[PDB]
Design brief:
binds cholesterol, 613 residues, alpha/beta, secondary active sulfate transmembrane transporter activity (chains A, B), transmembrane (chains A, B), binds 1-palmitoyl-2-oleoyl-sn-glycero-3-phosphocholine, two-stranded antiparallel ribbon, elongated, binds decyl-beta-D-maltopyranoside, binds Lauryl Maltose Neopentyl Glycol, six-stranded mixed sheet, homodimer
């Protein structure tokens, strides 16, 4: 077959350089971008059906996730309504449904509970004033999140969600599922547990829940259990029996309607003391300017909430964009969601993002442009102004049960943890650390810890790389580690060291130790011994994988070269990239008799050059 | 001359694997290690002189740095005495002088002031009780630092000081010099400034200092200014006139002696209301167990103090070890300094490390084994029990002036910042960020911010690497970027992409964008267009610099291969290391018709294999 034949001079870097010479309408993405391009002839019907279905789903989801946040039911309707309108303009995606997404809602509720506890606020009971304070804190956090998102959009730094690695995303998702389960289990049992704010909050909440389980409400617990069983069974049947009924069954909506009708018919509120929403405001409240003074106490939480909400939004947007063959602008997603969160925070809402289930409902029911979003917003509006009184007898345990039933996919990544461990130990470590940190910390603090742990794992992987003592495969130009192939011959009086990482301070110390181990000695000790009195003659450094190089690395390279030259040992560098050589030359490496003539193209010109002497 | 000639088959990874087959008395380092090995015949005289000189220096330095800490003068004597004895046993180094090192002292004093303010403690004035509380807090912090250091010694994690990069070390050093200058300027002016704890503390301290400058004491200011001028002038003359007097002149000791004698003679305390130490305890106080309850409020500070103190200790130890041709055990340095800090914290001392100036004094005066340290400790002892009354009239402004005069070398790295910027922009950015963060934050918080900023810079450098579209140098096996050499020929219908970094999630997105830019299109869009209807035929991925690889990277590689195979474009991988291929095979890469036959040794076997078809 084909053979590897090449005839050329031995080029050093100096010789190679000598012979081969070197050397305005998108920030506000208009609705006019697609409204004139709209397809009125047929798209209206699909948009209307999809919007009605996803609005029916989104009213329920906003009401349910308003319990995850520490705000009364009814403001979830606002959080489902306002962000859709203020995303219809700036939004790039045309399939995602904008709403609470109970993970962001639970982080918001954790912030609100930390900044407005029951005992800290009410010292008399002042339900109305406490609810007003909780709503105001939620609106302030939403406005801060929107400001952060808009700032990130202005700076065009949309690559930050790259840092949200899949292992840490999965660990954070499982931990958030655990937190949501704990909160909604507190809700369904109708047990009054004092809210623990800080570290080990979830564990203390569980301890108090199982302590006060004796005070559980039978009606609320039974309703929640029955709702969970019905929803999960219907979802399982739909997953199995999937060839028919292409649209997913809106089991949650029907379950909530039946529960509300039954609770209105037999009046669980007064007969069994059931926990119902008991209050939904009618009409739209006037806007209020959030107090910016609280911004200092929400920074570490607003940053994490903005990052998580945007990551979920673009995740769902990209999942549906690769399906419908279009691209979503990430920086414009910053802009759209930041403006949306600011607008919603002014109008008394909590942080807005998209939900995978709601987006799936919207798309599977004839998903088309964001007009379906507008129809969903109109449905939420008519629920706000007309259907507010009808949903009063509905139990909060039903909404919590709906959320718990939806938590299954988020609970299932414990199954993929072991295969992650088998595939790559550091990824499983990232997963487990993110999960545990998000459990015994805040969810925001857990996210920040997971991000910095991912950064630390990258730093450790580049700091302790693979390094090999290379010898030649006979009659070829293939150099491989002498301990791996058993047919590798060691050349005459020269050691070849491949350091498979960029050289920086941690890699400085690692590379010094690796050279000392490879050559079997160190230059300083032998030089001092020879001075007091008064095996290897060359070391080739295979730097093919050296990506970058800093001033500490350049200093280390100069020190290594000088120390080995002191004991008549020549150090040659091979396979260095052009930019690394430029870094060397601008860092002052080529001074004091270096002259770039000890740099070869690969680790075979070095050996040939040695054999010439 | 020598020519590059090689004849071999074209090996893929599969073919290459087919033909070439693969596959108890040191933790307590005894004084008995060198006491029997001691050289009594001649080493006693050198040890005695060096110990007396360095003890005379260390008494003054401990007294001066006790002002950097928020403890009364006299406990610096204990901090200079006890750690030396408890380091004489476990210490590896035999040249460093154990003591306060005013940077660690200032961080300790910042912690103590934050945990014991004047207004928070004294509400009546209770100088004695406030001093006792400050001393107890300092001892608690010292014990916590020693516990952390001993734990780090048990875990053998001595590579952590590698993360203290030279740029961030320099920035932190300059910021610490600024903080020390501010504190000692507050001391010399004898102006009562309320202590600002937290962020922008140094700026507020300066504002109040220049506001209250009208209350300055003329005698203290003049004494401090004269001491500074004398010390700096003598140091400059010694640096210039250096051929004679090999031992550095102990100008600080003579200056302090003269100042104390003058203040005793003419009684500045009552005549000019000068700020003198006014109190030094006689004898050794009994030990007290620090209250562990405060450990929760010192963790982020104790960690940074331990890291900084150990880093300084091993820095000086290595500087003198490479001079005297010996090696110091870093993990045993953890053990020794942790035991020393625990012992000192029990006996009412603040955190102990080494000082470069004191170590230079000890070594230059006949530096020998740690017996000189014991002699210095004895000198400090006789100062504690006898010379305590003699040093009472000494002004604290003199000690602050001594520290300010010594601050020059720490202030001089602003000169090396611009050359750092010229050499490597990221290193200068690390320097400036560390300096600014340590300025507008705590010094401990500044150190932590600098550490995680260095980690972030490493992550960013590996996340946005150099990537090149490679073409062949004619009649050779040299492939270089087509835009750099102007003699590079692009092969027939194939693009070669070198991605000079390990592939991870950030690098996943970067590499996808790089491939899309190089080939001039993306696989998904063209595949979808062809499906709706119903330039490049190969892409070689030069992965020579790919160091590691994670599950996200493996998934990305599989997705890229499948997407390009969908449009009849073959993707070949070349120059991959053996461990990266092992990572691929254990991550499930070689499934669904991959079979390792698309992996070549270098980017010349790929081109030859293409030319075979
Ligand atoms: C882009 C990259 C990421 C950016 C991240 C940005 C984080 C910003 C943090 C901001 C910060 C530190 C600033 C310095 C941080 C240095 C870190 C160095 C790190 C080095 C790598 C501000 O610190 C000070 O906090 C004061 C309050 O304590 C605040 O209020 C004071 O003045 C007011 C008038 O101005 C006056 O009205 C008010 O009365 C005063 O008190 C001050 O204004 C403010 O300066 C800390 O505050 C954050 O908020 C909470 C405070 O309690 C705290 O909440 C947590 O509570 C749960 C437990 O209970 C926990 O479980 C939750 O999680 C979380 O809800 C957060 O934890 C904390 O973080
Ligand atoms: C190896 C790797 C590194 C390890 C680093 C270890 C850091 C440990 C920090 C510990 C910590 C956070 C824990 C969670 C951190 C999560 C981080 C996530 C990061 C994600 C990227 C504990 O948080 C809680 O703090 C409470 C006090 O507030 C403390 O006391 C409570 O219970 C007691 C009875 O137990 C009871 O007696 C007490 O009355 C209670 O109040 C609790 O016990 C404790 O749990 C924060 O505490 C640290 O100490 C100070 C507190 O004020 C604070 O001091 C600063 O003040 C200056 C300004 O004034 C500032 O300028 C200085 O710098 C610094 O002096 C620190 O800043 C803070 O850090
Ligand atoms: C500070 C903030 C919080 C940080 C918390 C800690 C975060 C980091 C956590 C630690 C890393 C955890 C990685 C995942 C655990 C193993 C998962 C797995 O595959 O199950 C295997 C079980 O095998 C084991 O569990 C043993 C190996 C892992 C534990 C080693 C000792 C830990 C010492 C540290 C204490 C069996 O599955 P297999 O595939 O058959 O093999
Ligand atoms: C606030 C933040 C502050 C900064 C961060 C602080 C935290 C920093 C955290 C960093 C800790 C990193 C630990 C893991 C290092 C790499 C592990 C690995 O397999 O890589 C290499 C081996 O690794 C080594 O050889 C390392 C040295 C060995 C001894 C280590 C101590 C254990 C003693 C054990 C004692 C016995 C009990 C091998 O890699 P490869 O060649 O690819 O194969
Ligand atoms: C949050 C915690 C605190 C973080 C603080 C910020 C930390 C990071 C700081 C920023 C990086 C600072 C690097 C050092 C500054 C330049 C030093 C230098 O060589 O002097 C050159 C001056 O040239 C300049 O100063 C212009 C270039 C630098 C500034 C660009 C805009 C900054 C926008 C950001 C606002 C001239 O010298 P030359 O060699 O002739 O060239
Ligand atoms: C708690 C922790 C939380 C998570 C971390 C949070 C912080 C995350 C921080 C990360 C921020 C990293 C910024 C620097 C990125 C690399 C810079 C560089 O030269 O590398 C490459 C270019 O860089 C790019 O191409 C990048 C994309 C370009 C646009 C970027 C936005 C600016 C828009 C400007 C708008 C105009 C105004 C080039 O590298 P090379 O090939 O080697 O040459
Ligand atoms: C890019 C890097 C970003 C790093 C961001 C770091 C954010 C942390 C700042 C300070 O840390 C928090 O401070 C709170 C101050 O209140 C603590 O609450 C505490 O407040 C109570 C009262 O002090 C304590 O008793 C409780 O332990 C606890 O809830 C909380 O635990 C602690 O985490
Ligand atoms: C490897 C990752 C390591 C992460 C380490 C994170 C350490 C920070 C934890 C909490 O942060 C601190 O909390 C203090 C709580 O007291 C704040 O003091 C504050 O206390 C006063 C009272 O609340 C405020 O008014 C002042 O702004 C300020 O001094 C201080 O500013 C803030 O930094
Ligand atoms: C389809 C789903 C949503 C219907 C939910 C309706 C709810 C309100 C119904 C369904 C099951 C019912 C419970 C069934 C049995 C009992 C025991 C009886 O001694 C008191 C009433 C009580 C506790 C009922 C309360 C109301 C209840 C919880
Ligand atoms: C509310 C409290 C109780 C939640 C506690 C959650 C913790 C304990 C759980 C959540 C996910 C779990 C991990 C999921 C999967 C695996 C792989 C298998 O080899 C068992 C261990 C390991 C690594 C688990 C360890 C325990 C774990 C981290
Ligand atoms: C070890 C390997 C072979 C297990 C393979 C099956 C995996 C997917 C299953 C089997 C049993 C499961 C564990 C059973 C019980 C618990 C406790 C609870 O906290 C949930 C997670 C955890 C820890 C599960 C994680 C996933 C798990 C480990
Ligand atoms: C990858 C890096 C960034 C992770 C850093 C995590 C660190 C800062 C966190 C993780 C868990 C935290 C601990 C959790 C619980 C407690 C108990 C409390 O009474 C004092 C604080 C203390 C002791 C915390 C100190 C800080 C801590 C150790
Ligand atoms: C060698 C060094 C350390 C000697 C220091 C001695 C100190 C105590 C001496 C040196 C210079 C002296 C000052 C010189 C001039 C004056 C002005 C006079 O109207 C009041 C006394 C006053 C303010 C003196 C106070 C004491 C003083 C500050
Ligand atoms: C107490 C307060 C006033 C201290 C403030 C210190 C700050 C402002 C100082 C300390 C060191 C300084 C840097 C030192 C050196 C250089 C290089 C030169 O190109 C000027 C800018 C730059 C980058 C300086 C910027 C300002 C700087 C960061
Ligand atoms: C820009 C290049 C050419 C300067 C070369 C000379 C360097 C070493 C000198 C010249 C002038 C110096 C600056 C003069 C003034 C200040 C303000 C103060 O905060 C100290 C640092 C700083 C910022 C100095 C840093 C170092 C400096 C920039
Ligand atoms: C490289 C990474 C780890 C560095 C992270 C540094 C971050 C966490 C620090 C650096 C400077 C800090 C800010 C300094 C000053 C203030 C003003 C105060 O009123 C509120 C907090 C606030 C706004 C701080 C928030 C946190 C902050 C932005
Ligand atoms: Cl979902
Ligand atoms: Cl849900
Ligand atoms: Cl020094
Ligand atoms: Cl000094």
């Amino acid at each position: 077959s084909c053979s590897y034949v090449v005839s050329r001079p031995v080029y050093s870097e100096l010789a190679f350089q000598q012979q081969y010479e070197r050397r305005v309408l998108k920030t506000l993405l208009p609705v006019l971008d697609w409204l004139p391009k709209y397809r009125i002839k047929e798209w209206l019907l699909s948009d209307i059906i999809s919007g009605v279905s996803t609005g029916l789903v989104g009213t329920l989801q906003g009401m349910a996730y308003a319990l995850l946040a520490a705000v009364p039911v009814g403001y979830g309707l606002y959080s489902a309504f306002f962000p859709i309108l203020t995303y219809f303009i700036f939004g790039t995606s045309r399939h995602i449904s904008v709403g609470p997404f109970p993970v962001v809602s639970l982080m918001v509720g954790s912030v609100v509970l930390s900044m407005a506890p029951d005992e800290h606020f009410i010292i008399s009971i002042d339900f109305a004033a406490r609810d007003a304070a909780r709503v105001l804190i939620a609106s302030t956090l939403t406005l801060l999140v929107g400001i952060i998102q808009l700032i990130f959009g202005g700076l065009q730094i949309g690559f930050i969600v790259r840092y949200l690695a899949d292992p840490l995303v999965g660990g954070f998702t499982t931990a958030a599922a655990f937190q949501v389960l704990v909160s909604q289990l507190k809700i369904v049992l109708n047990v009054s547990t004092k809210n623990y704010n800080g570290i080990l909050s979830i564990i203390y909440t569980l301890i108090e829940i199982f302590q006060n389980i004796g005070n559980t409400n039978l009606a609320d617990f039974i309703a929640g259990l029955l709702t969970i069983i019905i929803c999960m069974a219907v979802k399982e049947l739909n997953d199995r029996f999937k060839h028919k009924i292409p649209v997913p069954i809106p089991i949650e909506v029907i379950v909530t309607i039946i529960a509300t009708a039954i609770s209105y018919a037999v009046n669980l509120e007064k007969n069994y003391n059931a926990g119902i929403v008991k209050s939904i405001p009618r009409g739209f409240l006037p806007p209020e300017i959030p107090p910016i003074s609280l911004f200092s106490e929400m920074l570490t939480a607003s940053f994490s909430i903005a990052v998580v909400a945007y990551a979920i939004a673009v995740s769902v947007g990209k999942v549906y964009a690769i399906k419908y063959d279009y691209t979503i602008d990430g920086n414009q997603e910053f802009i759209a969601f930041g403006i949306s969160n600011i607008f919603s925070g002014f109008f008394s809402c909590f942080v807005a993002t998209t939900a995978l289930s709601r987006t799936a409902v919207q798309e599977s029911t004839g998903g088309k442009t964001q007009i379906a979003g507008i129809i969903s917003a109109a449905v939420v509006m008519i629920a706000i102004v007309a259907l507010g009184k009808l949903l009063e007898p509905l139990q909060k345990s039903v909404l919590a049960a709906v959320v718990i039933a939806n938590l299954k996919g988020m609970f299932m990544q414990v199954c993929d943890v072991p295969r992650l461990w088998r595939q790559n130990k550091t990824d499983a470590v990232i997963w487990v650390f993110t999960c545990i940190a998000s459990i015994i910390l805040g969810l925001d603090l857990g996210l920040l810890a997971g991000l910095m742990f991912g950064f630390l794992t990258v730093v450790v992987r580049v700091q302790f790389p693979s390094w090999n003592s290379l010898g030649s495969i006979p009659n070829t130009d293939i150099y491989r580690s002498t301990k791996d192939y058993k047919n590798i011959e060691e050349p005459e009086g020269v050691k070849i060291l491949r350091f498979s990482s960029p050289i920086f301070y941690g890699n400085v110390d690692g590379l010094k130790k690796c050279i000392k181990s490879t050559v079997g000695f160190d230059a300083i000790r032998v030089y001092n011994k020879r001075l007091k009195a008064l095996p290897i003659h060359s070391l080739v450094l295979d730097c093919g994988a050296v990506s970058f190089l800093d001033v500490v690395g350049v200093r280390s390279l100069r020190m290594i070269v000088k120390e080995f030259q002191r004991i008549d040992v020549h150090v040659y560098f091979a396979s260095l990239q052009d930019h690394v050589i430029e870094k060397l030359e601008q860092c002052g490496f080529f001074n004091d008799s270096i002259r770039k003539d000890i740099f070869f193209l690969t680790v075979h010109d070095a050996i040939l050059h040695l054999r010439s002497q």
